[PDB]
């Protein structure tokens, strides 16, 4: 329960509105993060934020730690949004960003285009790197993972779309 | 058939069949099931007095 | 789909293109249809239009059916048909002609096929006959086995046996319109159309089409 006993340490410029279980965080360059909590959870507003549990059951104990981590991501996101890196390995593989349409040529017969939902923005500083930006961890990591299943990496040469820190297992032909 | 009809009549007065028979044996009453089922249908005001007699036996 | 015309099969013919190929064609005569009733959601549930075509002598139209044809000043015709329309407007007394079709324009033709009275299983279900020699006894075009022993010990529902090659309604899909004769009220269609000559056929836009 060491995660549930840690505060959130809310940054300087934010706002916390608590009307019942429904909770929100307000911030800059992106705001309006909302979620509600199961009726088995405690949140104690102060100069900080703290989490407890109504009950002693096992499920209530496990869900207290999820609430602490979920709110923490909400707190960071409005202040410092989360960001994911994708790298492209292989000749003739390149990606270019155009507003809300990301086009990828990944060796198929036909180049494919990915549509970026509201929220996130992608921009490619290079022709082999993708930069996914956003305000929530779950949506940013979902779209990054949706851009990877187009061509997940190969062990023999590493060709495909990979995370910028993902280790790719390699091997050689017999 | 008599039991199923005393059961229906006792619950309108707030008592189950098995709790009624326990109270009736407890107080002294020994009326048949055939006569109890007849009072339940027709002499409802007499059945009510018997039922509240069985409750008053603390059973 | 959802809106078409009612016509009469006139027969088969051919037309020769300029490049020499011959197109097998069925002629369909569509006398202009007359809108008889308009069915909407707030009156009927579903949404459709009702249509009549042809000509009927006054002695064969009954009193109830004549006052229905007189609510909309339409005059009685043979038969009455209903087309379940999607989103269209039609007032009572309107005209519907072949001019809602073009060339190309894959269409579906609905008709009632020819009737073969009481057919055997070879003709109806494409069974194969037993021997014509080699000792076979009075069992040449008969079906054969129709079940198993004690287990089930009954004939299963839907078993294929003989009787009545239907004069039922069938539709042939994705037929190509070759020519539309507005002035003569004709509709030249490539292929074969169910039924005999002079029968009623329903012509509607292609249900599938796509490719």
């Amino acid at each position: 329960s060491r995660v549930a006993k840690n505060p959130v340490k809310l940054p300087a410029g934010v706002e916390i509105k608590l009307a019942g279980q429904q909770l929100s965080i307000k911030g800059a360059k992106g705001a309006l993060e909302l979620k509600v909590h199961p009726s088995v959870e405690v949140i104690q507003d102060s100069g900080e934020l703290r989490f407890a549990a109504r009950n002693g059951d096992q499920q209530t104990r496990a869900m207290a730690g999820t609430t602490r981590a979920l709110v923490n991501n909400m707190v960071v996101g409005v202040s410092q949004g989360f960001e994911r890196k994708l790298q492209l390995v292989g000749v003739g593989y390149k990606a270019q960003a155009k507003g809300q349409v990301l086009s990828l040529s990944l060796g198929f017969s036909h180049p494919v285009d990915y549509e970026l939902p509201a929220g996130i923005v992608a921009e490619t500083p290079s022709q082999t790197d993708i930069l996914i930006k956003g305000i929530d961890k779950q949506l940013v990591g979902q779209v990054a993972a949706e851009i990877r299943d187009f061509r997940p990496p190969e062990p023999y040469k590493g060709k495909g779309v990979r995370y910028a820190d993902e280790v790719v297992r390699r091997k050689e032909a017999k | 058939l008599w039991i199923a009809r005393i059961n229906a009549g006792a619950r309108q007065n707030g008592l189950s069949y098995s709790r009624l028979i326990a109270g009736l044996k407890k107080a002294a009453i020994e009326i048949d099931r055939k006569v109890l089922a007849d009072l339940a249908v027709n002499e409802k005001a007499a059945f009510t007095a018997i039922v509240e007699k069985a409750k008053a036996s603390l059973a | 789909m959802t809106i078409g015309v009612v016509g009469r099969k006139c027969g088969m013919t051919r037309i020769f293109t300029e490049e020499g190929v011959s197109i097998p064609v069925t002629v369909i005569e569509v006398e202009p249809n007359r809108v008889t009733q308009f069915k909407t959601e707030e009156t009927d549930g579903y949404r459709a239009v009702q249509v009549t075509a042809g000509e009927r002598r006054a002695s064969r139209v009954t009193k109830a059916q004549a006052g229905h044809f007189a609510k909309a000043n339409v005059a009685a015709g043979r038969g009455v048909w209903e087309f379940r329309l999607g989103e269209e407007q039609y007032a009572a007394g309107d005209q519907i002609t072949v001019d809602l079709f073009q060339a190309g324009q894959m269409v579906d033709v609905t008709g009632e096929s020819k009737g073969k009275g009481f057919a055997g299983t070879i003709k109806r279900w494409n069974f194969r006959g037993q021997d014509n020699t080699h000792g076979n006894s009075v069992s040449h075009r008969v079906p054969g086995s129709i079940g198993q022993c004690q287990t089930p010990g009954r004939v299963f529902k839907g078993k294929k046996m003989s009787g009545h090659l239907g004069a039922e309604r069938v539709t042939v899909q994705s037929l190509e319109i070759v020519r539309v004769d507005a002035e003569r009220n004709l509709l030249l269609v490539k292929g074969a159309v169910p039924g005999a000559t002079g029968g009623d056929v329903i012509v509607r836009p292609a249900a599938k089409a796509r490719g």
């Binding site: - | 009809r5 229906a8 009549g9 007849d38 339940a40 249908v41 | -």
Partner: protein
């Protein structure tokens, strides 16, 4: 002195309305079946129809406990070989909500000509309203 018997010509019947909006499927149906038969009246005879009329309004909001929402299955055969057909609780609430309560109540009634007259007195709807305001049904708590 002979035991009283109910004549089917002078049987008193009342209308009730019950709200199936969070109630367990099986514990709601046992009480419904008890009223449809007359087991709540002292005039009950096993061969006449002496129960009341029941109206159920919020059919689609009935619930089951445990994992029965996705695992409870409904089967029926069509008469043709390999004609067994299936559906579950989740999909039948979307398709035909009223069939869920009628099926539960129907299996708790006798399977004979009288058990089908008692089933004829049950009206199940999926909204919050019924067309039977002319009969003025009363409120029945479970």
């Amino acid at each position: 002195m002979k035991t009283y018997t109910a004549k089917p010509e002078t049987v008193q019947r009342d209308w009730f309305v019950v709200d199936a909006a969070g109630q367990t499927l099986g514990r709601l149906a046992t009480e419904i079946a008890r009223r449809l038969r007359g087991k709540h009246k002292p005039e009950y005879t096993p061969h006449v129809d002496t129960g009341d009329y029941i109206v159920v309004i919020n059919a689609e909001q009935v619930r089951v406990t445990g994992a029965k929402t996705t695992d409870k299955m409904y089967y029926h055969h069509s008469g043709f070989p390999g004609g067994i057909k299936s559906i579950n609780f989740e999909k039948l609430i979307a398709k035909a909500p009223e069939r869920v309560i009628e099926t539960a109540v129907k299996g708790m009634l006798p399977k004979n000509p009288l058990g089908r007259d008692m089933y004829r007195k049950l009206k199940v709807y999926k909204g919050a309203s019924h067309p039977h305001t002319a009969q003025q049904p009363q409120e029945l708590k479970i």
